[PDB]
C-alpha cells in the first residue's frame, strides 16, 4: 500500500516548517531547503513546525508515516536494523519496533497498520499557545538511514498529514530525511554536492 504522497495544502494551508540550523558540523539536526531534506542524528530530537495558514479545530490527528525515496522500494516499510529492536530501548510508551517517536508531547499514539505493516505515529493537534505561532512537534528518529536490514542505506520520505478526529484529510505534506551521526557532514555530501 503506497500512501498518497500528494502535497495537500487544503483549505487550512498545511505547510511544513523546519528550523534552519545551518550547515554547521556541530548540530543535532538541520534542514536543507535546497532539496527539502532534513538531516538528523541518532536518537536525537528533531523539531518540526506546522505552518498552518488556517488554525485547524483542536483535537485533530497528526499522522506521520515514513516511506522510502525510491519508488520501487516504496512498497517496503521503514524499520530498524538487526541490532536495534531487541535493544529494549522502550520507555514504556514508545514501542521498540517503531523507528519514529514523539518527544515533549505526552499525548503520543502509535498507529500500527496490519494490512502492510505500516508503522506510523499519530499525535493529537496541540493548541498553539501565546508566543507559539507554529505548532512545533518534537520527532525523534531512533535509527539511521544507513542502518542495514531496515533502511539499508536508503533515503526516506516522511509524510506528515493532518486528519480530523474521524479521518478526513485536511492537509498533507512530505519531506526527505537522512539520519546519521553528523548532519553537517552528510549535508555537505548532498546539498553542497548538488550546487
Amino acid at each position: 500500500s503506497v500512501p498518497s504522497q500528494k502535497t495537500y495544502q487544503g483549505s487550512y494551508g498545511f505547510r511544513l516548517g523546519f528550523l534552519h540550523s545551518g550547515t554547521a558540523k556541530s548540530v543535532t539536526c538541520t534542514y536543507s531547503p535546497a532539496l527539502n531534506k532534513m538531516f538528523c542524528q541518532l536518537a536525537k530530537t528533531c523539531p518540526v513546525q506546522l505552518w498552518v495558514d488556517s488554525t485547524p479545530p483542536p483535537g485533530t490527528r497528526v499522522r506521520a508515516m515514513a516511506i522510502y525515496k525510491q519508488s520501487q522500494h516504496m512498497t517496503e516499510v521503514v524499520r530498524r536494523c538487526p541490532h536495534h529492536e531487541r535493544c529494549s530501548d522502550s520507555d514504556g510508551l514508545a514501542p521498540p519496533q517503531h523507528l519514529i517517536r514523539v518527544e515533549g508531547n505526552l499525548r503520543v499514539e502509535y498507529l500500527d497498520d496490519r494490512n502492510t505493516f505500516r508503522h506510523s505515529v499519530v499525535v493529537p493537534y496541540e493548541p498553539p499557545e501565546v508566543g507559539s505561532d507554529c505548532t512545533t512537534i518534537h520527532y525523534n528518529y531512533m535509527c539511521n538511514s544507513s542502518c542495514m536490514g531496515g533502511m539499508n542505506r536508503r533515503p526516506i520520505l516522511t509524510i506528515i498529514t493532518l486528519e480530523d478526529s474521524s479521518g478526513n484529510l485536511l492537509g498533507r505534506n512530505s519531506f526527505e530525511v537522512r539520519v546519521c551521526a553528523c548532519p553537517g557532514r552528510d549535508r555537505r555530501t548532498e546539498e553542497e554536492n548538488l550546487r
Partner: protein, 144 residues
C-alpha cells in the same frame, strides 16, 4: 613481544562484532580471554539497551571517527590504571563496534580500532606489561 595485549583487545572486539548485524565483519595462561569474555558479555547486554552509559558517553558526537576515539580513550585516563575502569572501557568499545556495523557506519569502528591498535602496541602494551593490567585483573577476578 607476544602481543598478548594487542591480540586480546582485537579478539574481544571481533567477538562482539560477531553479535548481530554484521556485514564486513563477517567476510573481513591467565585465561584473560575467558575473563574478558564473561565480564564483557554480561556488560554488553546492559550497554546494548541504547539508553545506557554509551548514550551519555558518546552522545552522538559530530565526528564519530576521531572524536569518538578520544572520548573513549580519555575515559580510561579519567581514572587511570583501574581494573574496574578497564571493564567499562572494553564495554564501551565492545557495544559501540556492534552498533557501528549494525548501522553500516563503518568509519566509526574502522578508525577507532586503527588508532587504538596503534597506541596499544605503541604505549599501552609496554605499560600493561610492566605496571599490571589483565594479568593483575585475573588475580582478583578468577584467581582470588
Amino acid at each position: 613481544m607476544s602481543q598478548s595485549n594487542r591480540e586480546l583487545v582485537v579478539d574481544f572486539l571481533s567477538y562482539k562484532l560477531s553479535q548481530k548485524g554484521y556485514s564486513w565483519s563477517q567476510f573481513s595462561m591467565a585465561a584473560v580471554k575467558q575473563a574478558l569474555r564473561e565480564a564483557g558479555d554480561e556488560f554488553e547486554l546492559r550497554y546494548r539497551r541504547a539508553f545506557s552509559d554509551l548514550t551519555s558517553q558518546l552522545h552522538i558526537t559530530p565526528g564519530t571517527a576521531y572524536q569518538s576515539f578520544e572520548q573513549v580513550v580519555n575515559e580510561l585516563f579519567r581514572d587511570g590504571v583501574n581494573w574496574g575502569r578497564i571493564v567499562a572501557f572494553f564495554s564501551f568499545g565492545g557495544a559501540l563496534c556492534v552498533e557501528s556495523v549494525d548501522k553500516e557506519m563503518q568509519v566509526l569502528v574502522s578508525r577507532i580500532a586503527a588508532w587504538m591498535a596503534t597506541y596499544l602496541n605503541d604505549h599501552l602494551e609496554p605499560w600493561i606489561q610492566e605496571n599490571g593490567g589483565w594479568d593483575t585483573f585475573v588475580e582478583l577476578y578468577g584467581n582470588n
